[PDB]
Amino acid sequence: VNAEMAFWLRSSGSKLTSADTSGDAAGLRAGTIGNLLGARIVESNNLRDTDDEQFVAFHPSAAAYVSQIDTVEALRDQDSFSDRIRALHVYGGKVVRPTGVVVFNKTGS
Amino acid sequence: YKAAGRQTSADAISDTGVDLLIDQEKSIDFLVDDIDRVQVAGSLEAYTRAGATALATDTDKFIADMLVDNGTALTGSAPSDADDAFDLIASALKELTKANVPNVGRVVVVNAEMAFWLRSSGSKLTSADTSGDAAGLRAGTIGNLLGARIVESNNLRDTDDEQFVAFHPSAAAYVSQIDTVEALRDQDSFSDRIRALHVYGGKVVRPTGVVVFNKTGS
Amino acid sequence: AFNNFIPELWSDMLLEEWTAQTVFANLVNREYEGIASKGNVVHIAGVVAPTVKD
Lengths: 109, 218, 54
Known about the structure:
The structure is cut from a larger assembly and holds three copies of chain A.
Chain A: H1 3-10, H2 26-29, E1 35-36, E2 39-40, E3 55-58, E4 63-76, E5 83-95, E6 101-104
Protein name (chain C): Major capsid protein
PDB class: virus
Keywords: HK97-fold, T=9
């Protein structure tokens, strides 16, 4: 979930900000969202939409990613008395199964 | 690196910065006659405790005003009920999270008018179902909310409408450079002179790490 | 009084940027990193079920 969405799970109307409707005071005191409906909830600012609500729901096996090369290197510049720091990441990813991923506010940006 | 055709060249690095000025100088300076010190019914030492307390107050008032004036403004209107007040705190903590401000060690400082809603009949804390226990009813205790520590102060600028600041400690800096007290004699009478100097300054080094409800309130 | 002898001081510590916590790399399936150490493509093949006939 994005931050705009995660606010609703911690707002005054939330099931989680009450020791009555949830099991205990942890969602009021510590702010813990926890698991909902068997799903593990996670929150991120790296979703594309930052000012409307956006989330993705998926099974891990629906999408794959691989990191192949990840390296960092120090050099001396040829044009100046400078160090040069460079790094390379080589990777790829695929939604192997597209119906295993569900997106709310897909066009959000 | 692919669109470049497997070529790379080095960019030049850059920085940003902020200035913290040490530009507040505040003093206490008062006289006590030896005749008065002998003739009064008990100790005059409460006047030196009062001086230290005045400089500590003048400091708290500066830091509170600095956070209020230079923090980012939280959007919204004066809370109409105990749920609007809870939602302003939950909304403030969202605005820190959108700025990537750390999750551990957040503080909310509330004025008395804001704290009334947290102690009110509609508050989650004043019912032993919505909170886990009777402590917020019997003892009036405001614990943590949403992982944040809640602190009450009279030294915020607005005293007749709700005002608060939510921040991470590392977002705002304060230095005391000189904080000395001395006793000397007067030249023109048999009197002590007690004087104290405080020299200090502060800055919101990170503006997005402080959010302010009712910024313009006075 | 002193126009020239009072310094301005620079902190020896840089403020590191506050940046978003990265989460997605640990949530997706990684099992092909065992095979994908070598080539530029992995082919993933799926069954088509045999059809039930009347």
